[PDB]
Write a protein that binds this ligand. Structure first.
Ligand SMILES: CCc1nc(N)nc(N)c1C#C[C@H](C)c1cc(-c2ccc(C(N)=O)cc2)ccc1C
Ligand SMILES: CCc1nc(N)nc(N)c1C#C[C@H](C)c1cc(-c2ccc(C(N)=O)cc2)ccc1C
Lengths: 161, 161
């Protein structure tokens, strides 16, 4: 199935997670653990922002313009992106805002890191309707030496009911 | 022992909790449940802001100026406030910012509601040093129909170790 994974500051603000306060090592470990050996779908700015494929995974880039790197697979539509992942238990949509908004209707699971911090940005995570989603897990953590804000991991699952 | 109870927006901002977004009914129930039948200590603006004693409890007001209501006990110092509570298992310090900063060194427990919201304010909860405190409980909750932001209850306890 299709899952969205994102780190959200207050007001559901997202930004390219090489800036701060998205340099939270705990979120980085959570991200790695939850995307390990799964194909990942991303947009072209996100691809530009990481500079090299995530290792040991099919990396798919969803963009209207022709590809410029043969270490990844380039596609033009959501359905081509999904077909490019093949028959796998879980596809991880990893950014950015426009890619999140195109895959939200097909997604069944959300892996959200709620970060207790304020950042300027126009880019918000899509507005998941509380009624369509059930929170199945959360785990709060204080700020510590490695992590400069408090943060909370959350997993939600789309309701049939 | 002495406990501080407070609702904190992002950046540890606090404000008189009759304004929003401190009108979160879930926080109100958490507050009630954790202060029921315990004496409460508050500052004069907090006392002004509630307009009437919290029922079924000794209400103590810590202020430098003479009292103006005989339904509560007025004191001038921290030690008079604590002595006025008598021999009880738990004293609840309920606001405001200056009262929190005077009782923090004697406190052994903190009941914090972390609210996922931004509010203007100069008044911050004191800067509890992460090393002196252990988080013993947390519980995250999504925004829903009654509660307009996501929030997390937390309890911390002062370390001897
Ligand atoms: C790790 C940050 C993150 N957290 C959560 N919860 N969800 C996400 N979707 C992203 C993300 C992201 C993008 C792909 C991104 C990743 C990285 C990144 C940083 C370090 C590693 C690593 N080598 O482990 C991988 C990717 C860098 C820039 C960007 C724009
Ligand atoms: C309920 C808000 C709150 N939450 C948390 N976690 N900690 C606190 N210390 C306060 C507080 C407070 C102060 C005393 C306050 C309480 C109230 C209030 C509102 C409703 C009731 C009630 N009748 O249950 C009681 C107090 C109103 C204004 C203000 C300045």
């Amino acid at each position: 199935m299709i899952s969205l994974i994102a780190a959200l500051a207050v007001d559901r603000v997202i930004g390219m997670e090489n800036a701060m306060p998205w340099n939270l090592p705990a979120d980085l470990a959570w991200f790695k653990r939850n995307t390990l050996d799964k194909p990942v779908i991303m947009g072209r700015h996100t691809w530009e922002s990481i500079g090299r494929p995530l290792p040991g995974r099919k990396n798919i880039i969803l963009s209207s313009q022709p590809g410029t790197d043969d270490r990844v697979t380039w596609v033009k539509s959501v359905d081509e992106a999904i077909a490019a992942c093949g028959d796998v238990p879980e596809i991880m949509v990893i950014g950015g805002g426009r890619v999140y908004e195109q895959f939200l209707p097909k997604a069944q699971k959300l892996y959200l890191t709620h970060i207790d911090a304020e950042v300027e940005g126009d880019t918000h995570f899509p507005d998941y309707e509380p009624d369509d989603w059930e929170s199945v897990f959360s785990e709060f953590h204080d700020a510590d030496a490695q992590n400069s804000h408090s943060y909370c991991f959350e997993i939600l699952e789309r309701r049939l009911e």
